[model samples]
Target chain A: DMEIACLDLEGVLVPEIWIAFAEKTGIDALKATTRDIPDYDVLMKQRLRILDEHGLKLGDIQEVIATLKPLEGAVEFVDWLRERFQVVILSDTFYEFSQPLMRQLGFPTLLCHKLEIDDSDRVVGYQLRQKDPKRQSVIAFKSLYYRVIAAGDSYNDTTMLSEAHAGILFHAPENVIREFPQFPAVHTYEDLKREFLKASSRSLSL
Target chain B: DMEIACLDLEGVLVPEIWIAFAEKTGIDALKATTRDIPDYDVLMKQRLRILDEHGLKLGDIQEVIATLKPLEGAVEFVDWLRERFQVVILSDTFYEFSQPLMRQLGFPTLLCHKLEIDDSDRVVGYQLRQKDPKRQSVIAFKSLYYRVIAAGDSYNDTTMLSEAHAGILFHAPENVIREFPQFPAVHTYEDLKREFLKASSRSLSL
Candidate 1:
């Protein structure tokens, strides 16, 4: 009877922070999502390289991120999910970048990374709580005898989706959806809810 | 301004789980609180020793814990606090023991410890996420530029209270209140809210 709804933060519920920052700064290199590049370390290193070249700091990116809000219908959708399962948002984004958005979304349980800043608040480095945390979280929940149903919108989340009892790709990019056709993909909150309900019923079945 | 409400779990919002377990099992040695013995390491080791003598396993304690619920008006108080500030419950209890109560309390952000259980579900050891996590959490929030107001009811919570912008002792024992006389003491949730509101104003004042 114990169940967990593992959710992705960006794209699934809100705009991607890096994408938002790129738009605010007109830096095209910062627009890549996990949908585009699957290796998080490679992507993050490239992002930091671009930031260094452009003289952008952590505070500057956070300024852009602060203005971002939850996606339309996401609040209602999250509220609905909360009524049924223990909801945890697993993200690749650092906590410093995600806190504002989490507050706006009623602050669901967020398991994310940390950003290291120098004295000047420059994004000097980052820390991963664990390698492959998204998948690891699903596995941990399963090990604790929790039936997990995970939903995400990118390539990075596919591993977690694979580990969950039921996996869903919500409003994901075409490439990701095509790449992981084994998981159910939904374009709207209604469809996502339906898939979740279907999965919930299956989990409860003998 | 970013404001955070750092709250203690047991003896604040919920009944003390260990006390409940002690009362149920009739183990007088297991009834000690931080209010009684402030050194958590010493307290925990003693607890483990008592559990060993009694032939109690992790599953046995968990069985008792699963039957416990939040204290009266705690849910409403938490909801009210959440509507006003970023609330994080900082506790000394392990996550394995606190999850069910967190779910019942609407799942606020909880920073707690972990318990190490053996293959037979015996309580082999415990792990602290960070030593003095309550105070460390308040300091972390402060470093992140958050104005924190902390509330708790025992000796262990005093350090966190001291670290915050404003601190209050809610329903604390007379000894703790007498010892930490600087913090405002409140008996009711309404009084606690008043102190919080006063602190909120002070944080906002020029």
Candidate 2:
């Protein structure tokens, strides 16, 4: 059986794409995130419209992404993780918008959507990879006879966490952690590693 | 400015996937579709779990998909519409499962999700190309100065219909049509072509 660990990309590995773009462009409308609007389509449409209003295209966002880095200790954590188990980065960001950042991480296998760009470099549309991918990733691993473990920082990863054999909250918001108290919370990489070991230990013991 | 036609694949173009799979395998769990459950993720999770329970794999589902065909007039309608306006097929079906059908439809540009099938031929997970992609695709077209006209024949397509400049229902259930009466309804491909022309004609004549 395969031992699997699925992680969310934005908050778990790097900073949020929309949030970073918002800061770079200084656009208030761009600040709204996955946490603010539960409807992913509504949020993206609004963001894309806002980007158009400001004449920001995919290349402009990629410029902002170029300046970004993985979260502190993220690389080490991932390196350590890949050594121990199969890792999948489940992200909400687009493949077109995240290439540079993904390369910085040594191009781990990513499950993400694509961006539809027009000839003039205008940001036109996004194509999704699946319906609800994060959670589905966990479910898929479990279905394939893998003992799945999932972790993330944001509320978006909650479902993915829920579907995993063991879920962990890493640097998550206080309210979200409180809401889903059943999952163990870890603030640092050390704690995260400990939690992972604990979760894997249980599966192995079984 | 561009005039765009956003269409639903299942029912509108090809026969339904889940229904066909259910009929083939005699697994009633596969029968629940987007029409029956408005929440796409919830319905999909349930389907994935049921598929796992039945020990069904990607190959098994593909066997059923291979036998399906596009609706009678869908190909001609799409070909005709493409000449007049930018056409995009916005669907909830996965790229992995829908390639054969997509090929049959002249390989029109599609905005859809993907499935993650492991080496064992088991579909362990699905990847969304984007969140709420159908509606977002319409919204994106509109954002790029396109006058969006959309149509579908199921409950899940309602939001995409609502978001379009002019929403239409083609061969939809009676209750669904009654609920969204604002969207003009049509049953035949000839009428579908007429409705598309009428909707675009209003924009032109305006």
Candidate 3:
């Protein structure tokens, strides 16, 4: 039996971070227009610099993360998915942000960015060390099993979704959907489940 | 001053009822997209029917409600708003569900849905009374000393937002934005606050 996994963090698990960030900074985060941060390493450095410049500390980040509300049915859905598959959080968000959520969801394997904080707990820089740039974690899962499916919702998720046999996009923006037309797109979890089950059933029937 | 109250039942205060409903029914509640239940009253009845069909008791509903989480920053935001506005909860969810949340948030009034249960405490039906409709509330507020401003994200909220001196659609869907082209759309509380502040400043200037 092949395992099915889902990805995507922002819109799937929580509301868009860009919107939240914009609200905090009073700057339009959407104005950047760059779909995914082109250079993970450089992007993290710049983001950290910006945060530092704005006098934001690790405590501030923690406060923000603490107040982050999970999307509807997120916890329950993760529990349900874990029963059938090895669910993982493949995200570009730093480990600091992802840790609390992951712990809340019972510590699912997280493939995400890492913040380099000093002893004073101030964010100094970041580490972009994916074991494999091509996402060896996902690739390993694919090689270990014959059938695998991945789901995501943003440009950052495209690389992981593209490497999967079947990819599902959930409640993605028009721009994202347009960029990745090959992947099946859906709005709600119910629709995603239906598509996934159909795909699984077809694979088994064959 | 105008009294600006909010109803925090499920979606507004916590999460959506559909999540618990689906878990109890062992079905994907999102798939049942029948919109005939226009208001919270009809929706509650429909939900009760589904629960009854699933052999769930009123206790189960109470249990879920007890465990329901407050939305991120919901309590804080409500507290802050209460300092300036006469915020109340005009929810269609049962008082049992709203009371604890309201108490936790230090909210004063709760005009909530009530259930008429059988001897076994199984909900047989519901009371379909709204203490304040959106339009009526808006008119009532306008009658008071202050101007009105409304913000919400669903179809049910339309009537209320429409009657306000200024209205905002919070991260609304494309269809909603398109349908209510006259109203301003925003995604975060900060932006909403800014808009309202600007309006307040303008009103004061005038």
Candidate 4:
């Protein structure tokens, strides 16, 4: 049997994209993420409304993303995972926004959504590939008879964790960790690696 | 700098998708692939015309794809590559047709185009993600300061090979092999691995 690693792209592998955009544009209200807002639609609507108020277009957000980097040790951590398992990045972010960050991370497998732009180049709307794509992607993998080990850092990833053969919380806030205590929480790349090995080993035994 | 492995999906990892469909449908004309036809548009037009003549729908093709498997030793080879480098499948096929085979391959990163379907589940048109996406993808990766080593098995893949830091032709026909004499051709996965290692090491020494 084969095993695949389903990982969250935003908070787990890289810093929160919206937060970085918020910092660059000096719009603190745009900082709310899946950690703070459990409902992605709600969070995204609020973000779009704020962007409209500030006259920020798609180009402005992409400009900030162009300067972003992966989290500390993320490249090493990813390389370690790649050497052992089929790694997939399942994110709620749009492909247009994540391209630069993906390039920096050596362009791992990314399953994300698209964005709708008009001729004016304004960010008119976002298009999700499907509802709850993170969990859905894990389910799709499991349907292929492969065991999935999922990891993330916020409320959005809980469903994905619940569906996977194994789950992990990486660099998650205490609030999310306490709320979802059934899954193990890991604070560092080293700890994450240990947890992943344990989970993979545990599956093999079963 | 980081290194990325860009692989051609159909001939490199899995059997040609249309050939499998042709076998199932008993339509020999449907077997023409990039290995046999150098021009993608001309090849696709012929396939679509044959499909229309045979009255095949998207569902029928998907049924054939559902029963398909990867080529011999493809899984082990992919695993070996994943263990060594970040692997991406760059294909000319549409996502709708390749999902099942991708699932079988453990869902590594895939960059491909899409198909436009009518209400009756018949494929109405094919939309390419961009012109010369295989080569464009390699260029995009290189722009990220990544040194890409690409491998493929057909004429369509030659541009992608040219754009990479190094290229390999696996299981290619004598015609294409002789045509593109600059690239090193290998007949087996073992030889492919050896060529890949040599190219990577050569890049590092440079």
| Weakest 10 consecutive residues of candidate 2 chain A by summed lDDT | A197-206
| Candidate 1 per-residue lDDT over residues A72-179, each given as its tens digit | 999988877766566878888887788778878777766677777777767778877667888876775554455789999988789999999889999888999999
Model 4, range B8-57, lDDT digits (tens) per residue? Answer: 99988888887676888877888877789889888888887788788888
Weakest ten-residue segment in model 3 chain A by summed lDDT: A197-206
lDDT of each: 0.80, 0.76, 0.59, 0.79
Report chain B TM per candidate: 0.89, 0.84, 0.73, 0.84
Ranking by TM-score: 1, 4, 2, 3
Candidate with better lDDT, 1 vs 4: 1
Model 1 segments beyond 4 Å from truth? A1-10, A14-206, B34-38, B201-206
At residue B6, give the lDDT of candidate 1.
Answer: 87
lDDT tens digits, residues A81-156, model 4?
Answer: 7655668888878766787788777667676766666677677677666677777777666544457889998877
- Alpha-carbon shift of residue A101 in model 2 (angstroms): 1.2
Residues A56-167 of candidate 2: C-alpha lDDT, one tens digit per residue: 7778877888988888899888877754555667788876687777766655555666667788888778766567777776665554445778998977788889888889
- Model 4 bad stretches (over 4 Å): A34-39, A202-206, B1-206
lDDT of 4 at A35: 52
Model 2 local distance difference test score: 0.76
Score chain B of candidate 3 by TM-score. Answer: 0.73
List, in the given order, the native-contact fraction of each candidate. 0.10, 0.00, 0.00, 0.18
Q: At residue A37, what lDDT does model 1 achieve?
A: 79
Worst 10 residues of 4 chain A by lDDT: A197-206
**Model 1 residue-pair collision total:** 0
Best of the two (1, 3) by TM-score:
1
Candidate 1 lands at a TM-score of 0.57
